[PDB]
Amino acid sequence: RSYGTPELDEDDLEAELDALGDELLADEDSSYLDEAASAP
Amino acid sequence: QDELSQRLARLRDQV
């Protein structure tokens, strides 16, 4: 598998990542962690 | 030295 990433606006990416972290902070549901660990 | 820097250094000291 290859994981090339296109050119991205790096400052905007940082802002969008933080906003996504904020959606995570405001979400009590952490079950994705357990789903990821149990995946085949 | 700084107690915080020292505590962190001591915390990470590999023994």
Added chain:
Amino acid sequence: LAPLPPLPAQFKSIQHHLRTAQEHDKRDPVVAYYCRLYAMQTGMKIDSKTPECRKFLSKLMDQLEALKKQLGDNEAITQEIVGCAHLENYALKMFLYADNEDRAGRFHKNMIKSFYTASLLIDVITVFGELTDENVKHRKYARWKATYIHNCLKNGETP
């Protein structure tokens, strides 16, 4: 663990890694410890002098010491080389879960969060030293996919 003071504005860049620590306080205390260690080391480099910042770091240090005491007989805590290995395998597992969902065309919050948190865990791994080649690539890719897929969903685009 004694709660931390309000996060100083200076430390915005460790906010999310501290949430990853809390997410793991029961699930994986080794991960929780190292997320806090990354946050502490990073914060000390940012600002260890402004009173609000120093207060915050002092309390984070208290949490680290309490955790290290609680988990003292754990090889992943007494040897950072072993802790790094634990974080590496754990983060990879999470990354590959998200990757596999993406490549199956299954787009949802759980896989977005998995890409996002995998990237945060790779940030945390920098506390141990230079990232591996795969870590550099996977982190770049996870940051891209977390945001790209989130954006596609909210705006009706097909990834």
